[PDB]
């Protein structure tokens, strides 16, 4: 019973159109919820609500405070690669090197003479979009939380890297942790425990992959 | 009750030999548990399990989420001494200067003209093993947590500094916090509430100092 949403509705602006209308779902401990939908459906807004950045006008949200959020939009702080990944968290080599492996970063990092000690600027203009996205995801999965909110992390990644990361990181490395993935890929949806399809703030579908297949 | 392990067994590699075999212990609030053993016994692995970095194949582990971990292997991030000690933790002068004093760092820091504003590199190559170990322990004790996991912090320290740190930091500064100290020293074991002795993944002894003395 890790994440629970009951008749939840919220608005970004008072008196406006609700960004999310009567949202219901229950994600059990260690399950994978896939959040699909059209552009502007309210997917990020739903994650913003779980984070407490969006307050519901009506309904109730229940979860344990330990949340790690991966943005759609990569952000890299000034400092080394290691500084960016480990961040506020303490350093454990097994966890660090396992996360690098899972997030397809080992080859890129080893290409540099200074390895993880290479200094990045702000925004990581030196790195590629994919390298930036991988560092951002690595940082998020390196944070030890009870819930992982991954908002479209594979957006600027090639299909081959995305396949490796989804299989070895989202599915293998984070297997026992409750996680919410914003994705509209069938390839990802097949591996989901439950699927939420949003369209214009409303829940168009909620159920298993087999239930979605039967439509 | 703060930390409990009942019939806990875990493996690093599937189908291998278990790293920890049938581990049982209950550490009450504010108690000091000493974890002793031979090299390769599974001490670090036990702490890793408390962290969630090692998943048990069998058994149950219970504790409150607020954990501060001190590694066997000192790690230094690029930045100042102050930056390294307050690792993303809010700054309080009293706590800061009290932790420095307890961890025998004041004299070393005051030797530098720039004091705690001196810039360190990654791995603290500029500092001695003892200085690196002290900064790592300071960082860990500066973090306000319910449970403190101190994995062999005195390993690269001289017996005189270690005596001062154990007495004024582990025993005085952290006096009413639940602490798990990985140590094989009788001098430290006499001050422990409970003692766990590991040998090749197995619990060879579990009990009080008086019980250990009577063997």
């Amino acid at each position: 019973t890790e994440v629970v949403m009951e008749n939840v509705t919220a608005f970004w602006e008072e008196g406006g159109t609700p960004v999310l209308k009567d949202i219901n779902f229950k994600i059990e401990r260690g399950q994978l919820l896939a959040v699909a939908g059209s552009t502007g459906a309210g997917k990020t807004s739903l994650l913003m609500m779980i984070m407490g950045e969006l307050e519901p006008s009506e309904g109730k949200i229940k979860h344990s405070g330990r949340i790690s959020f991966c943005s759609q939009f990569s952000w890299i702080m000034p400092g080394t690669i290691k500084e960016n990944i480990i961040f506020g968290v303490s350093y454990d080599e097994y966890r660090y090197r396992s996360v690098i492996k899972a997030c397809q970063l080992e080859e890129d990092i080893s290409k540099f003479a200074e390895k993880d000690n290479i200094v990045l600027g702000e925004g990581g203009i030196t790195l590629s979009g994919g390298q930036r996205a991988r560092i951002s995801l690595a940082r998020a999965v390196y944070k030890d939380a009870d819930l992982y909110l991954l908002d479209s992390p594979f957006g600027y990644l090639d299909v081959l890297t995305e396949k490796e990361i989804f299989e070895s990181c989202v599915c293998k490395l984070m297997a026992n942790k409750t996680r919410i993935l914003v994705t509209s890929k069938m390839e990802h949806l097949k591996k989901a425990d439950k699927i939420l399809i949003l369209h214009e703030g409303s829940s168009y579908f909620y159920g298993t992959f087999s239930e979605l297949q039967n439509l | 009750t703060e930390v409990v392990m009942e019939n806990v067994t875990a493996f690093w590699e599937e189908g291998g030999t278990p790293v920890l075999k049938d581990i049982n212990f209950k550490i009450e609030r504010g108690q000091l548990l000493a974890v002793a053993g031979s090299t390769g016994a599974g001490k670090t692995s036990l702490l890793m399990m408390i962290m969630g970095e090692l998943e048990p194949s069998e058994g149950k582990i219970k504790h409150s989420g607020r954990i501060s971990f001190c590694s066997q292997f000192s790690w230094i991030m690029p930045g100042t001494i102050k930056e390294n000690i307050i690792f993303g933790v809010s700054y309080d002068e009293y706590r800061y200067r009290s932790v420095i004093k307890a961890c025998q760092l004041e004299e070393d820091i005051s030797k530098f003209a720039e004091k705690d504003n001196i810039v360190l590199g990654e791995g603290g190559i500029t500092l001695s093993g003892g200085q690196r170990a002290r900064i790592s322990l300071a960082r860990a004790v500066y973090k306000d947590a319910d449970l403190y996991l101190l994995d062999s912090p005195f390993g690269y320290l001289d017996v005189l500094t270690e005596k001062e740190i154990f007495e004024s930091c582990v025993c005085k500064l952290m006096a009413n916090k639940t602490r798990i100290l990985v140590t094989s020293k009788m001098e430290h074991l006499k001050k422990a509430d409970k003692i766990l002795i590991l040998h090749e993944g197995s619990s060879y002894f579990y009990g009080t100092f008086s019980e250990l003395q009577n063997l």
Epitope: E93, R97, I100, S110, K115 | T44, Q72, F73
Partner: nanobody, 123 residues
Framework: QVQLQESGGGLVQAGGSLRLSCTAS????????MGWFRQAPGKEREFVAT????????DYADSVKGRFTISRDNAKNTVYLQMNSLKPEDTAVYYC????????????????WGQGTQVTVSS
């Protein structure tokens, strides 16, 4: 990316002891998983012992377990191999190697290699 040089080899009588050293010249020594490998005359390079960049993980070949000890000093950019209670089987050229990938004891995963040192254990 890292240049390795071994030392400490030579002739020893069985039951004896020998300590090998390996200094690495290059950036980010701590990133590399260091390993000791032996090549017996006519045989392939076999894994002996490995150490993670941190020094947190140490693994040994079944044959050397309990007799050999691998250690690291990241401040001195050196890796050591303490070979106690030597048998004539241990006669081989001992190589020191660095791997830029995490946790493999297979020599195929090690990119940078040293010149090697001959170790001879007389019966």
């Amino acid at each position: 990316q890292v240049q390795l040089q071994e030392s400490g080899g030579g002739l020893v009588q069985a039951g004896g002891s020998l300590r090998l050293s390996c200094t690495a010249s290059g950036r980010a020594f701590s990133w590399y998983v260091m390993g000791w490998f032996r090549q017996a005359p006519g045989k392939e390079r076999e894994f002996v012992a490995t150490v993670s960049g941190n020094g947190s993980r140490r693994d040994y070949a079944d044959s050397v377990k309990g007799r050999f000890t691998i250690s690291r000093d990241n401040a001195k950019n050196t890796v050591y191999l303490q070979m106690n209670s030597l048998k004539p089987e241990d006669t081989a050229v001992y190589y020191c190697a660095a791997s830029s990938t995490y946790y493999y004891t297979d020599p195929e995963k090690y990119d940078y290699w040293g010149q090697g040192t001959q170790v001879t254990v007389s019966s």
